[PDB]
Design a protein around this ligand. Sequence first.
Ligand SMILES: Cc1cn([C@H]2C[C@H](n3cc(CNc4ccc(S(N)(=O)=O)cc4)nn3)[C@@H](CO)O2)c(=O)[nH]c1=O
Ligand SMILES: [Zn+2]
Length: 258
Amino acid sequence: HHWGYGKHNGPEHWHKDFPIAKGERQSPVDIDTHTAKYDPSLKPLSVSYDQATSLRILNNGHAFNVEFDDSQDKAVLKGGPLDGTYRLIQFHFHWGSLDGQGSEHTVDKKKYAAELHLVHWNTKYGDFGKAVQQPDGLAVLGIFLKVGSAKPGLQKVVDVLDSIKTKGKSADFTNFDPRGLLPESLDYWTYPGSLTTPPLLECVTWIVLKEPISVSSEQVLKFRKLNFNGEGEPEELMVDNWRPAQPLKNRQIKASFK
Ligand SMILES: Cc1cn([C@H]2C[C@H](n3cc(CNc4ccc(S(N)(=O)=O)cc4)nn3)[C@@H](CO)O2)c(=O)[nH]c1=O
Ligand SMILES: [Zn+2]
């Protein structure tokens, strides 16, 4: 697989290797705020990250992943639209070359500067690889980033990026607290969708928070210094690693808030 975000290997090409790219529950989507309906059946959302154990940060040539120890129920997502317990395995971001683009989800066609994805798998399927084969295998908590005041809880991530500049580089990343990346409100939209990168599996319950976090221009400029390429290859800045909005088809976006 040589998929990426360029003219020759970007989102408009992914369907050739991954025909599910044109499927019935692809992500991301535009969230039409006027059409999304409050759902009183939604239970309270439970983000329980007190025991989260971060291990490492990896540049995988598409984004960087902050990886967690998911060998036990430590950092879990429950409630809201979810049945059962979903374990945090990694988080990553998508971002732009410019502050006016970068998010995958859009809100009334507005693009944010970036989007954070906290990826969790359903513990009833035993491991992540089994979970991605199930329609309810994953829950991704999506958080928008706008440029304004710095996010203090993000700075430890920003400061390690110079040690993982190129594809395949990793660094120790223990004792990182993902609670520092959350906005005040847990108001959210939810809909059934997919991974937003190949293999684009239709296994995700999306939970997208309404309240963005603010990060500084300096923080996002450091994301844009990363490289898609490996060490000793021509430099290709890691920017615009977002898939655009996909057709909603036969789906309803539900709101947690009246
Ligand atoms: C802790 C750990 C991780 N790994 C593997 C599997 C991990 N993985 C695979 C994928 C599938 N791809 C994906 C995910 C989200 C989105 S999005 N943009 O949110 O819709 C798109 C694509 N997601 N995470 C991966 C990262 O940690 O490393 C283990 O094998 N053992 C381990 O112990
Ligand atoms: Zn993502």
